[PDB]
C-alpha cells in the first residue's frame, strides 16, 4: 500500500538506468493510486496533448497523487506514497531558485525558451515528462497571470492580444525568463470566470457604503504613491450618516467568505515546504 | 480447538521440474541486471 | 489508529457534532449525527416522522430552541469530533441513515473519501436545509466544488434570489464540504439496524480511517 | 502459501487458529429382567436339582 | 472419488498400516450387493490381507 512497484516492455540498459539512478528522490505523479501500475501511465506523457490547453493540464495533474522514485535495480523502479507528515528528500529538474522559508506546488512544464525540452529517457512512442516543484509566488503569479490571459481577451482581434500577451506571458522571478504556452478558452475557463463574476458582484453588492469611500477620503485626506496609482485607477469615472456595528460585523464576514471563494481559483493548497536547500540547488529536505 | 497441522514440504530439486533447470545458486543477483550469453555461429 | 479523549456527555457508528449553545452555561452541546436528520429536508418523511417519534427530549427542545435561533450561521456553530470507539463515553479525534447518503459517480473507484455537505434553501419563507454525506473519489478542493456548483445549481439560484428579494437579510454561505477520512469500494455495503425495537434504513461504511477536514465555506 | 513479486496482492495471515464444537449424539436400549428369574436368581433355597 | 475427498487433520502413522510397509488411506464401505459387483468387477486390485 505504501510502496509502489512499476514495469516497462522493454528492458533497461546500463546507459538508461544510469541516468535513472541519478532520479533517486525526485516526484513523479500517479493517475490511480494502485499497488502495481504500467510505465504507460506514469509521469505524465499519457496525459499531454498540445493545442488542447496548459490550463487542462494543470487542472488534471493537480488531480494525480504523488510520489517519489527510489531504489531501482532493474525492471523495479517502486515509488514511494509520502505519508501526511513525515520529513521527505525531494529533487527538482525545474530550473527555479529555492528558498528555505518558501512553500511548494507543482505545475505543469512549460517550455523554457532554449528548445532543449529534456526528456532524460525516450522509448519508441513514450518520453517521461516531469512535473515543475516550483515555490509558491511563481504559482500564485502563473494562476493569476493565466487567469489575466482568460478574463481580458473575451471579446478582442488577435492583434492587440498578441501586443499584450507577448509581454504579458513573460515571468521575471529570481533571474529566470519564463512563458504560458497554451491558456486556450475552455468550458474550465468559462466557470472560473463565471464564478469570479459572481464572487465579485458579491463583494460590489453586499459590501458597507463606508468601504466604498474609504480611498475617496484618503484621497482628500493624505499623499502618497499609491493613493496617485489609486487616484489614476479609479479618478476617471468620478459625515458619515448611517452607522451599524453588527451590521457591519456581518458585512465584513460575507466579504471575507466571498473574497475567499474568489481567492479559491489561484490559491492550491500547498504540496511542499522546505526545511533546507542544497547549495547547489538540487535537493530538498521538507515536510508533508 | 485446532490450527493447520497437516502441511508437506517441497523441494525445488526433489520436484520433477528440475530437469528443465541448470541450479545455480549465485549470491549477487540483486545487484545483476542483466545476463546475457552470447554465441557466434559461422554456416557451412 | 486511535486518538481518544472523554467526553461529558448504542452503534460505533456515529459523529460527535459540537454545536454551540446560545443559552449562557453549557457554552456547547454534543450532538450525534443522527439527529441532523430530523433538520434535514432531503430525507424521507418516514424516517423523519421516526426520529421524531423515538428522541423526544427537553434538550431535544432547547435543540430546536437554539439550532432555529440564528438562520444561516450553522456553520459557525457546526464542529466535529470523529467516530466512536464506544458509548458517558468517548469519541475517537460507520453508520449512515440510507437517503442522506449519496454518490454521484458510479461509486467504482477504489479508495474513496467522504465529505459533508450541507446546502441552505432559501425559495421558501426563510431557510430549510439539507444534510448530504458525499462518498466521493475526488482528493482535491476545487475540483470538488465545481462538481458541487454542477450538481447544486439551484441552490445558488436560491442564494443570489434571497440576496436580491431581502436585502436586510445577509446570507453567509450556501453550505459546507468537509471531508472526514476514507472508506475502500468494497467494505460500503447497503445494510440494516434495529434500535430500540424499530425498523430504520441504514448502509454502513466498514473500515474507515479517521483523517478530519476543515469546514471550507463555498458558493 | 506461494508467493510472486507481482503486483497481485499476497496474504499475511499463517496458522489461522479454529476452534470446533462437538455435537452429541446419544444411544439407548432397553433390557428386561423378570421378578421371577431375579428371585432364582438370588435366593438359592438350596434343595435338589 | 478417492482423491477429491481432501485429506484429515492428523494421523497416528502407526495405525492402520499392513503388512510390509504400505499405508491405508481411508475406508469405503456399501452394502452387499454392491460389493458383489465390485469384487465381481475389479477383481485384480482387490488383495484380501
Given at each position: 500500500?505504501?510502496?509502489?512497484?512499476?514495469?516497462?516492455d522493454?528492458?533497461?540498459?546500463?546507459?538508461?538506468?544510469?541516468?535513472?539512478?541519478?532520479?533517486?528522490?525526485?516526484?513523479?505523479?500517479?493517475?490511480?493510486?494502485?499497488?502495481?501500475?504500467?510505465?504507460?501511465?506514469?509521469?505524465?506523457?499519457?496525459?499531454?496533448?498540445?493545442?488542447?490547453?496548459?490550463?487542462?493540464?494543470?487542472?488534471?495533474?493537480?488531480?494525480?497523487?504523488?510520489?517519489?522514485?527510489?531504489?531501482?535495480?532493474?525492471?523495479?523502479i517502486?515509488?514511494?506514497?509520502?505519508?501526511?507528515?513525515?520529513?521527505?528528500?525531494?529533487?527538482?529538474?525545474?530550473?527555479?531558485?529555492?528558498?528555505?522559508?518558501?512553500?511548494?506546488?507543482?505545475?505543469?512544464?512549460?517550455?523554457?525558451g532554449?528548445?532543449?525540452?529534456?526528456?532524460?529517457?525516450?522509448?519508441?512512442?513514450?518520453?517521461?515528462?516531469?512535473?515543475?516543484?516550483?515555490?509558491?509566488?511563481l504559482?500564485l503569479?502563473?494562476?493569476?497571470?493565466?487567469?489575466?490571459?482568460?478574463?481580458?481577451?473575451?471579446?478582442r482581434?488577435?492583434?492587440?492580444?498578441?501586443?499584450?500577451?507577448?509581454?504579458?506571458?513573460?515571468?521575471?522571478?529570481?533571474?529566470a525568463?519564463?512563458?504560458?504556452?497554451?491558456?486556450?478558452?475552455?468550458?474550465?475557463?468559462?466557470?472560473?470566470?463565471?464564478?469570479?463574476?459572481?464572487?465579485?458582484?458579491?463583494?460590489?453588492?453586499?459590501?458597507?457604503?463606508?468601504?466604498?469611500?474609504?480611498?475617496?477620503?484618503?484621497?482628500?485626506?493624505?499623499?502618497?504613491?499609491?493613493?496617485?496609482?489609486?487616484?489614476?485607477?479609479?479618478?476617471?469615472?468620478?459625515?458619515?450618516?448611517?452607522?451599524?456595528?453588527?451590521?457591519?460585523?456581518?458585512?465584513?464576514?460575507?466579504?471575507?467568505?466571498?473574497?475567499?471563494?474568489?481567492?479559491?481559483?489561484?490559491?492550491?493548497?500547498?504540496?511542499?515546504?522546505?526545511?533546507?536547500?542544497?547549495?547547489?540547488?538540487?535537493?530538498?529536505?521538507?515536510?508533508? | 480447538?485446532?490450527?493447520?497441522?497437516?502441511?508437506?514440504?517441497?523441494?525445488?530439486?526433489?520436484?520433477?521440474?528440475?530437469?528443465?533447470?541448470?541450479?545455480?545458486?549465485?549470491?549477487?543477483?540483486?545487484?545483476?541486471?542483466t545476463?546475457?550469453?552470447?554465441?557466434?555461429?559461422?554456416?557451412? | 489508529?486511535?486518538l481518544?479523549?472523554?467526553?461529558?456527555?448504542?452503534?460505533?457508528?456515529?459523529?460527535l457534532?459540537?454545536?454551540?449553545?446560545?443559552?449562557?452555561?453549557?457554552?456547547?452541546?454534543?450532538?450525534?449525527?443522527?439527529?441532523?436528520?430530523?433538520r434535514?429536508?432531503?430525507?424521507?418523511?418516514?424516517?423523519?416522522?421516526?426520529?421524531?417519534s423515538?428522541?423526544?427530549?427537553?434538550?431535544?427542545?432547547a435543540?430546536?430552541?437554539?439550532?432555529?435561533?440564528?438562520?444561516?450561521?450553522?456553520?459557525?456553530?457546526?464542529?466535529?469530533?470523529?467516530?466512536?470507539?464506544?458509548?458517558?463515553?468517548?469519541?475517537?479525534?460507520?453508520?449512515?441513515?440510507?437517503?442522506?447518503?449519496?454518490?454521484?459517480?458510479?461509486?467504482?473507484?477504489?479508495?474513496?473519501?467522504?465529505?459533508?455537505?450541507?446546502?441552505?434553501?432559501?425559495?421558501?419563507?426563510?431557510?430549510?436545509?439539507?444534510?448530504?454525506?458525499?462518498?466521493?473519489?475526488?482528493?482535491?478542493?476545487?475540483?470538488?466544488?465545481?462538481?458541487?456548483?454542477?450538481?447544486?445549481?439551484?441552490?445558488?439560484?436560491?442564494?443570489?434570489?434571497?440576496?436580491?428579494?431581502?436585502?436586510?437579510?445577509?446570507?453567509?454561505?450556501?453550505?459546507?464540504?468537509?471531508?472526514l477520512?476514507?472508506?475502500?469500494?468494497?467494505?460500503?455495503?447497503?445494510?440494516?439496524?434495529?434500535?430500540?425495537?424499530?425498523?430504520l434504513?441504514?448502509?454502513?461504511?466498514?473500515?474507515?480511517?479517521?483523517?478530519?477536514?476543515?469546514?471550507?465555506?463555498?458558493? | 502459501?506461494?508467493?510472486?513479486?507481482?503486483?497481485?496482492p499476497?496474504?499475511?495471515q499463517?496458522?489461522?487458529?479454529?476452534?470446533?464444537?462437538?455435537?452429541?449424539?446419544?444411544?439407548?436400549?432397553?433390557?428386561?429382567?423378570?421378578?421371577?428369574?431375579?428371585?432364582?436368581?438370588?435366593?438359592?433355597?438350596?434343595?435338589?436339582? | 472419488?478417492?482423491?477429491?475427498?481432501?485429506?484429515?487433520?492428523?494421523?497416528?502413522?502407526?495405525?492402520?498400516?499392513?503388512?510390509?510397509?504400505?499405508?491405508?488411506?481411508?475406508?469405503?464401505?456399501?452394502?452387499?450387493?454392491?460389493?458383489?459387483?465390485?469384487?465381481?468387477?475389479?477383481?485384480?486390485?482387490?488383495?484380501k490381507?
Amino acid at each position: 500500500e505504501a510502496n509502489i512497484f512499476c514495469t516497462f516492455d522493454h528492458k533497461l540498459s546500463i546507459a538508461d538506468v544510469g541516468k535513472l539512478t541519478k532520479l533517486v528522490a525526485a516526484v513523479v505523479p500517479i493517475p490511480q493510486r494502485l499497488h502495481l501500475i504500467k510505465h504507460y501511465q506514469l509521469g505524465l506523457h499519457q496525459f499531454v496533448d498540445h493545442t488542447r490547453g496548459y490550463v487542462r493540464l494543470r487542472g488534471l495533474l493537480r488531480n494525480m497523487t504523488l510520489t517519489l522514485m527510489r531504489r531501482v535495480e532493474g525492471n523495479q523502479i517502486l515509488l514511494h506514497v509520502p505519508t501526511h507528515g513525515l520529513l521527505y528528500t525531494v529533487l527538482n529538474t525545474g530550473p527555479v531558485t529555492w528558498e528555505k522559508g518558501d512553500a511548494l506546488c507543482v505545475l505543469p512544464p512549460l517550455f523554457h525558451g532554449p528548445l532543449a525540452r529534456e526528456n532524460l529517457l525516450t522509448l519508441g512512442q513514450w518520453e517521461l515528462v516531469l512535473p515543475w516543484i516550483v515555490p509558491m509566488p511563481l504559482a500564485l503569479e502563473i494562476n493569476q497571470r493565466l487567469l489575466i490571459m482568460g478574463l481580458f481577451s473575451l471579446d478582442r482581434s488577435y492583434e492587440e492580444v498578441k501586443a499584450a500577451v507577448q509581454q504579458l506571458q513573460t515571468i521575471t522571478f529570481r533571474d529566470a525568463t519564463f512563458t504560458i504556452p497554451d491558456p486556450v478558452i475552455d468550458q474550465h475557463l468559462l466557470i472560473d470566470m463565471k464564478t469570479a463574476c459572481l464572487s465579485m458582484s458579491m463583494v460590489a453588492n453586499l459590501a458597507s457604503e463606508l468601504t466604498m469611500t474609504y480611498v475617496r477620503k484618503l484621497a482628500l485626506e493624505d499623499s502618497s504613491m499609491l493613493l496617485v496609482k489609486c487616484q489614476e485607477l479609479l479618478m476617471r469615472l468620478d459625515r458619515p450618516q448611517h452607522v451599524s456595528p453588527d451590521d457591519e460585523i456581518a458585512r465584513l464576514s460575507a466579504l471575507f467568505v466571498m473574497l475567499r471563494q474568489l481567492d479559491d481559483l489561484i490559491r492550491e493548497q500547498v504540496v511542499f515546504t522546505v526545511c533546507d536547500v542544497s547549495p547547489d540547488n538540487k535537493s530538498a529536505t521538507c515536510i508533508f | 480447538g485446532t490450527f493447520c497441522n497437516r502441511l508437506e514440504w517441497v523441494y525445488f530439486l526433489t520436484s520433477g521440474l528440475a530437469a528443465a533447470a541448470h541450479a545455480i545458486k549465485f549470491h549477487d543477483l540483486n545487484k545483476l541486471t542483466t545476463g546475457k550469453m552470447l554465441f557466434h555461429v559461422q554456416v557451412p | 489508529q486511535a486518538l481518544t479523549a472523554r467526553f461529558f456527555v448504542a452503534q460505533p457508528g456515529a459523529l460527535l457534532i459540537r454545536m454551540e449553545t446560545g443559552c449562557d452555561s453549557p457554552r456547547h452541546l454534543y450532538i450525534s449525527l443522527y439527529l441532523l436528520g430530523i433538520r434535514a429536508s432531503n430525507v424521507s418523511a418516514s424516517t423523519r416522522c421516526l426520529l421524531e417519534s423515538v428522541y423526544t427530549a427537553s434538550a431535544a427542545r432547547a435543540a430546536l430552541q437554539w439550532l432555529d435561533l440564528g438562520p444561516h450561521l450553522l456553520h459557525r456553530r457546526l464542529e466535529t469530533l470523529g467516530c466512536v470507539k464506544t458509548v458517558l463515553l468517548t469519541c475517537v479525534m460507520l453508520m449512515i441513515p440510507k437517503d442522506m447518503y449519496l454518490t454521484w459517480e458510479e461509486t467504482r473507484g477504489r479508495l474513496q473519501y467522504v465529505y459533508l455537505i450541507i446546502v441552505y434553501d432559501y425559495d421558501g419563507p426563510e431557510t430549510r436545509p439539507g444534510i448530504y454525506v458525499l462518498t466521493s473519489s475526488i482528493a482535491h478542493w476545487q475540483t470538488l466544488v465545481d462538481v458541487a456548483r454542477g450538481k447544486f445549481a439551484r441552490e445558488r439560484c436560491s442564494f443570489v434570489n434571497r440576496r436580491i428579494t431581502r436585502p436586510r437579510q445577509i446570507p453567509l454561505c450556501t453550505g459546507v464540504i468537509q471531508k472526514l477520512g476514507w472508506c475502500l469500494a468494497d467494505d460500503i455495503h447497503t445494510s440494516f439496524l434495529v434500535h430500540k425495537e424499530l425498523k430504520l434504513s441504514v448502509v454502513r461504511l466498514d473500515n474507515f480511517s479517521v483523517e478530519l477536514g476543515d469546514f471550507r465555506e463555498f458558493v | 502459501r506461494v508467493a510472486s513479486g507481482a503486483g497481485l496482492p499476497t496474504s499475511r495471515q499463517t496458522t489461522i487458529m479454529v476452534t470446533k464444537y462437538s455435537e452429541k449424539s446419544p444411544i439407548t436400549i432397553p433390557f428386561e429382567l423378570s421378578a421371577a428369574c431375579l428371585t432364582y436368581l438370588r435366593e438359592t433355597f438350596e434343595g435338589t436339582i | 472419488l478417492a482423491e477429491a475427498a481432501t485429506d484429515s487433520i492428523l494421523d497416528n502413522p502407526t495405525t492402520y498400516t499392513t503388512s510390509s510397509g504400505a499405508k491405508i488411506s481411508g475406508v469405503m464401505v456399501s452394502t452387499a450387493n454392491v460389493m458383489q459387483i465390485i469384487m465381481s468387477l475389479l477383481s485384480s486390485h482387490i488383495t484380501k490381507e
